[PDB]
From Swiss-Prot:
Protein name: Spectrin alpha chain, erythrocytic 1
Span covered, complete protein: 1605 to 1826 of 2419
Spectrin repeats: 4-107, 110-213
Other noteworthy facts: This complex is anchored to the cytoplasmic face of the plasma membrane via another protein, ankyrin, which binds to beta-spectrin and mediates the binding of the whole complex to a transmembrane protein band 3. The interaction of erythrocyte spectrin with other proteins through specific binding domains lead to the formation of an extensive subplasmalemmal meshwork which is thought to be responsible for the maintenance of the biconcave shape of human erythrocytes, for the regulation of plasma membrane components and for the maintenance of the lipid asymmetry of the plasma membrane.
Family membership: Belongs to the spectrin family.
Length: 222
């Protein structure tokens, strides 16, 4: 049952609160300090993106209501004008900045995920370098057959990692722009990561060939 003036005031208060929340989110652009915090901010940006067109539509009706109040001889003309124009200016500012801020946060989340993937894959290569660093090629036929069964399991666990390793080298190319990746400590880690990956591949290939040569030898020498 509210009057036009009461509905206008309630709508303005509702928009002011929504705008203040969106302005706070835009002011949190540089608070993405880890994956979880970037993720929290991305969820807020997804809600803002989803609500934008509905708020734009509601603002059109709020503007129509304000103009209806102004044309009907209301007492608080200046108060209505200031409330309406302030909400419209603040909405345009949110609308014009939101997508850029959202994109910067998607880049921050991607950078944090890249650093987690680099850490993980460095450890994975290091563990495989221990596994492959064997000079046991078998002393008898059953022995070399056991070693070849294990070496094929290593080659099976390995072949499927080329894309996980390439995802680190590609995401380093996609995020080659940002400073944190360009830092000399990260550029060294990426060169060493490639050095250890190729060394792991050089060792696995070489060991497999030695194991096949050993099986052939031990089959004649049994």
């Amino acid at each position: 049952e509210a009057s036009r003036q009461q509905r206008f005031n309630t709508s303005i208060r509702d928009f002011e609160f929504w705008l203040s929340e969106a302005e706070t989110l835009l002011a949190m652009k540089d608070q993405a300090r880890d994956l979880a915090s970037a993720g929290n901010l991305l969820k807020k940006h997804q809600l803002l993106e989803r609500e934008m067109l509905a708020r734009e539509d509601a603002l059109k009706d709020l503007n129509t209501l304000a103009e209806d109040l102004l044309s009907s001889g209301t007492f608080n003309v200046d108060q209505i004008v200031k409330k309406k124009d302030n909400v419209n200016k603040r909405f345009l500012n949110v609308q014009e900045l939101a997508a850029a801020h959202h994109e910067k946060l998607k880049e921050a989340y991607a950078l944090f995920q890249f650093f987690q993937d680099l850490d993980d894959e460095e450890s994975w290569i290091e563990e495989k370098l221990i596994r492959v660093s064997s000079q046991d090629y078998g002393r008898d036929l059953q022995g070399v057959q056991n070693l070849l069964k294990k070496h094929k399991r290593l080659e099976g666990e390995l072949v499927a990692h080329e894309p996980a390793i390439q995802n680190v080298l590609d995401m380093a190319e996609k995020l080659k722009d940002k400073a944190a990746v360009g830092q000399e400590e990260i550029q060294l880690r990426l060169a060493q990561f490639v050095e250890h990956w190729e060394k792991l591949k050089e060792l696995a290939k070489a060991r497999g060939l030695k194991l096949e040569e050993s099986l052939e030898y031990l089959q004649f020498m049994q």
